[PDB]
């Protein structure tokens, strides 16, 4: 008999956003058994072999589940969540439209679009800085190249499986 916050992390009443992914520190079959998945196989590790740990819980879009992989390049990978190429971790996603989607969409969920410094792996930047530096920072949104770092995806039942919501816990065993 062993207890871990993994049931708390996965079955979380409210998940965290991608820009601020909730970070917490055996038997892991309950993680893969409790819900059918669209993508759970470990990228950079073996699904069966998983059974310091950093449980990074957030919601990601169905088309972006593949984006959370070692060496992958994209919007989520470059800025939101960058992963080291030599990292041993598993990405686990299940379509939870029944749980975290909402009539009219669940907009509590956010992600970081662009940070000028390509995000170093395992690094979280929470600051609401308007898009950084450039020829003219201007400290305010009155023109181009100065965007708020945050955008949110609505989560509706009518959305397609690609746009439907997935509670991904990018656990990086170390």
């Amino acid at each position, epitope marked *: 008999t062993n207890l871990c916050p993994f049931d708390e992390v996965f079955n979380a009443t409210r998940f965290a956003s991608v820009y601020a992914w909730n970070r917490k520190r055996a038997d892991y079959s309950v993680l893969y058994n409790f819900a059918p998945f669209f993508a759970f196989k470990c990228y950079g590790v073996s699904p069966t072999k998983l059974n310091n740990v950093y449980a990074d819980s957030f919601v990601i879009r169905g088309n972006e589940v593949s984006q959370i992989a070692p060496g992958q390049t994209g919007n989520i990978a470059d800025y939101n969540y960058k992963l080291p190429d030599d990292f041993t971790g598993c990405v686990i996603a299940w379509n939870s439209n029944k749980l975290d989607s*909402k*009539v009219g969409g669940n907009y509590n969920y956010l992600y970081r679009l662009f940070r000028k410094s390509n995000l170093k792996p395992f690094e979280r930047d929470i600051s609401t800085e308007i898009y950084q530096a450039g020829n003219k920072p201007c400290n305010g949104v009155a023109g181009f190249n100065c965007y708020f770092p945050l955008r949110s995806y609505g989560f509706r039942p009518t959305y397609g499986v690609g746009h439907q919501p997935y509670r991904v816990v990018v656990l990086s065993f170390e």
Partner: antibody
Amino acid sequence: EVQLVESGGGLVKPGGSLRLSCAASGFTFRDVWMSWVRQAPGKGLEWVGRIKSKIDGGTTDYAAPVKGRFTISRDDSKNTLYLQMNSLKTVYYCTTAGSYYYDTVGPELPEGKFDYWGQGTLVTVS
Amino acid sequence: IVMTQSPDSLAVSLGERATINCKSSQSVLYAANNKNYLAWYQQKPGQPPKLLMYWASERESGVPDRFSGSGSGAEFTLTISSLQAEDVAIYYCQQYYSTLTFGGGTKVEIK
């Protein structure tokens, strides 16, 4: 089927102390951030306060005009929203309004209405 | 946060457009989410109120398209395409960014 009603109003001399209740059923009471609003006879609804869900800390808010004299609580067995009154001063509507945007509830709904609104109880002061 | 409706009492005939403007002291729009935190409730005389719209744009299910809303920043509006016999009620624009503040309340009636 969901329904929201209240009872217990009546005439009371100023200065007393009592409690008021509301009745709920047919929906997931625990998740929603139910609250209580009051409407004076011939006036508009004034936000008495909000009682948040236990998962979200259960924090209780109140408005300044009624701050320090009222208290809104919760119970699960009776599915009942409460509004106790202390130091009465010269119609009350239990609700779940303003909750869907913070509470964690799925898109499935009892009928499709995520709002729930009380019958309304008139409380008169001498 | 002080909430004010425009006006305190509105008159709209059968089926005409019913626009109810809302104004708030602070800024309700969340910079992160890029959408506002607003609602709209109608209260028929004598029985429970009901919710017209949420997020200042989204529509209640079970009620057809004549309900319409659009808000940005600290200025909000709910516009009703057609007013029916049961649609007659008294309205309360609401914000939930910090606490919840029903305004003075706008009552609509058949002209």
